[PDB]
């Protein structure tokens, strides 16, 4: 019933990664946790990309999917995103309470 446990573990594993990672020399988008996915250090003008977060209740059904977020040509993250691959396979229906909780984690 409580899968908030996995989201906080996912975030601090990302924070641990940022505390034990040498950043790339040059211009790159900083690795961070946007409360949805853990993003690695990404070169500029490059569509960053990681697997679907494993805190999702439907993670295994999309364990092979990926999240997308375009890094700008300046080291800052752009607005362009794509979480469609990691979405709920059957969107509206059950999973309300977490679809609802995840909607707050935006």
């Amino acid at each position, epitope marked *: 019933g409580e899968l908030y446990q996995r989201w906080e573990h996912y975030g601090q594993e990302c924070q641990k990664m940022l505390e034990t990672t040498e950043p790339p020399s040059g211009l790159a988008c900083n690795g961070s946790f946007d409360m*949805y996915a853990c993003w690695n250090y990404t070169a500029a003008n490059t*569509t960053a990309r990681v697997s679907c977060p494993w805190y999702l209740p439907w993670f295994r059904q999309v364990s092979a999917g990926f*999240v*997308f977020r375009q890094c700008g040509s300046d080291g*800052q993250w752009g*607005s*362009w*995103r*794509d*979480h*469609t691959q990691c*979405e709920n396979p059957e*969107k*509206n229906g059950a999973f309300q309470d977490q679809t609802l909780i995840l*909607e*707050r984690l*935006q």
Partner: antibody
Amino acid sequence: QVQLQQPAELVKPGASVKLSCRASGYTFTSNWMHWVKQRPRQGLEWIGEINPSNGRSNYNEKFKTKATLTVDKSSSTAYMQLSSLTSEDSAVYYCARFYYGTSWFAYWGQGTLVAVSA
Amino acid sequence: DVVMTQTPLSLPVSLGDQASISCRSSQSLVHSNGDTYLHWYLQKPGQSPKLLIYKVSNRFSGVPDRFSGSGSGTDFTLKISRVEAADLGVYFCSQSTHVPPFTFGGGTKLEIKR
């Protein structure tokens, strides 16, 4: 429960005006705010986007000197400003914004009809 | 920038038929993903556009099955299986693959033919 509420607006030629777009139903710093110019019976024109968290705005290369995007985080309202208004500005100005985790405009305000006359 | 042209500019019909509209971009919209980021919008008279379809063929929340999208690369199409009275309006196609800037099609008025 996402809602973007916008004011019509009456301006004088050669004067600047500022159009409000108040957000509600979501954490306002978590999503960029776009702006689209439209003269109904014609096409849509994307002005630019503004990241509310830091104020970083990138514009379309046809609306820079004309438009300036602002953000008021306390009231969770994003604005968008035109200076030296012309007859070419009599149009409807929407504020749009992607569905979360996407890049397609799933939410729109109902626009502000701007009419330029003294 | 990517130029989106539609055909027809005014495509007429009446109630119960199968209508279909085409959109075409100056470039290919297949991003490095392998996906295509073309979207469809319906703007009813005096209102804001409403998202009908995203990623070529994916239907948005609360859109009837009558709307169906297809196409690849540079040509895309939107089919209305049965045109009701709520389907009339101006249909816009939009791309988000090559941005900025975000570009829209010229739009097309769906109307009654008598």
